[PDB]
Amino acid sequence: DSIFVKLLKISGIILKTGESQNQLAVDQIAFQKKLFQTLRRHPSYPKIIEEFVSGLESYIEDEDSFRNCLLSCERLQSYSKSLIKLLLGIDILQPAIIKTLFEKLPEYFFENKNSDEINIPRLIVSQLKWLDRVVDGKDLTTKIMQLISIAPENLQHDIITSLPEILGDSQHADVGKELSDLLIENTSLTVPILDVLSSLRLDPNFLLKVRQLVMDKLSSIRLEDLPVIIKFILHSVTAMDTLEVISELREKLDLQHCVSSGQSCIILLFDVIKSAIRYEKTISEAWIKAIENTASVSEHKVFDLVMLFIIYSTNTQTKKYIDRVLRNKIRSGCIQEQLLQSTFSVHYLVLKDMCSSILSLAQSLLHSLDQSIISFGSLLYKYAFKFFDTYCQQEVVGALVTHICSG
């Protein structure tokens, strides 16, 4: 009886009640152009859209009918798209359809897997994807920005990741702008944000701003995600910025702050870093430079040694560089022994699987002069035998004996 249902029926679609899929009489384009030219030539020409959409919303007040409108259709001539998509292919209703779509979804925050175990809101947004034609692209943007500012977290986490299917190629700058303007506010949600920002078409000057932003918001993150954030950073870094970002990083990472209270994540972090500096080189030379030129600092933190070990264990061309620098900071007295104490009192687990590095180093430490160096190497051998396993202990004894007999 509605303008709406009559127009669809003449345009050649079976308005199934909403238990099974609605059937289709004609081609998609056939029906679309049919109803298009119909209401085009139709009198009451601008108001008929308001009448159409009012009848629509009045129809989809019901759950299942709405559900089946959302669902894909059925052919008679053998699996098609959905009515909503076919309708939103039309631009002259689109911004109407768009508006109508949002302001009802809030009902479906606390609806969750009733009958067919299929989640309405996700299914709604599904409708919005790969839109060939978008008149209302910018207004759409502003509306989903209202939505994204308000959204409950999970929904938020979903729509946000869904975003690049939804958008096009034109309107992303202000999008990212609003995103960072959200990120300054909230830091629980970086990771999706970050994936999306990797996904979208951007300028990098904005990425830099955001990078600095997170680097400020870098002690102010929970434990778990931390690693992937850093992962992002180290993906994001380049040939030139590297030094400075690392400096900031080396300044902002603490590792006395992170307390099953920090262990698994720390580990995973180190792994990540390990992968990073495996699958590129210049990270290491820059990193060294950064702790090397940290010369005035007598307030050296734990991290540095740990990373030194690691780099010694990994790519080896620089080993003599590492020795050299480590001798130099030792003679300078910037590196000392309560350092090594707390280093092996906590982060040892990282080092167990590179114990052989420690000894190959201590070997080159005791062959030098300058008692403090020799004392350092001693402590190395000592803790190595102390915390690690039998094979380590054995290698300790076997290296000391060599020192004795030969040295």
């Binding site: 969750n112 396993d389 039998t390 094979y391 054995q394």
Partner: protein, 370 residues
Amino acid sequence: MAVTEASLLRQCPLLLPQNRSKTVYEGFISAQGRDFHLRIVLPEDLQLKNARLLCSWQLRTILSGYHRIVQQRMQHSPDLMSFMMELKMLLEVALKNRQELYALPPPPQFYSSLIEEIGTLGWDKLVYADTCFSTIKLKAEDASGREHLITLKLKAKYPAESPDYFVDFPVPFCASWTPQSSLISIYSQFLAAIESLKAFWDVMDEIDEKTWVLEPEKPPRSATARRIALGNNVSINIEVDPRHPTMLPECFFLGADHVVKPLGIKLSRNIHLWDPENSVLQNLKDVLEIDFPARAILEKSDFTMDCGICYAYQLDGTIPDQVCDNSQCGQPFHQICLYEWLRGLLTSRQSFNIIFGECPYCSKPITLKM
């Protein structure tokens, strides 16, 4: 209020003066909806360094453990207001620790609706109820007919809150509790969690029946890792995905460095022939290209399968797994006994996590990986 002609009411409305001078206070004190008797007599001045304070014997039993804290706080407090505030905070923490003393149900909510919900579930799913009506256990059936029981702990008023549910199967059971969710709601949730890992059981019961299954002896439903005997003094172990059970589980062999050797060599060149559509046992019989001893002797001691160091089977549940790489010995050993023996030995040289040394029986090279 800031003034104690109103703040005294706002915080101890139950605690009020008798005497003309506001020096004799009596009344009650609220705590977890429990009004405890109290009589409190100040000096002429409003100094708490002396403040006579008697109670119920109820209350003195409950404060056995803090009368020294009372002596402290009566004398250290600036004002009766903060004194009583800290007192109530104290009472709450006391009962919080002594929370084992607490339950009483409302019948017409509870004892009415609960048997309607039992008739809703089925009286034959009903396996047990508690004399408290605190605990109740129920039965679910896998479509094969495996019984999966589950226990439920009921509060004073049940549907208001979640009951405490305790289930056998390994994955973390999630019960979406609304007050609209009833016994059959959680039962359907129980079934849906069962029907997710259904096809896992269909391979597990097959393996339980067929082959010389070793070391989840009497395997429960929780068990996702199994152990099977084969050949002689060579055992395999399996761990299966409940979600893709017919998918290749991760496995390895225990036994000899000449019996386990070509077994993996066959497996390497027949795993590609793994057709996940068949049963797991059937896939194995062709992948490994062998038949099992299908309970061929199961649990009957011919002295073959024995440690030779401790002379025992299932040493702390540890199986005779480490063997000799020798046709003449084939003496199987545990891990711990062989380790401790090759510990003291002089020839026993230690690599990363390996101990080499002579087999105790035959004095041939034997390798132990920890």
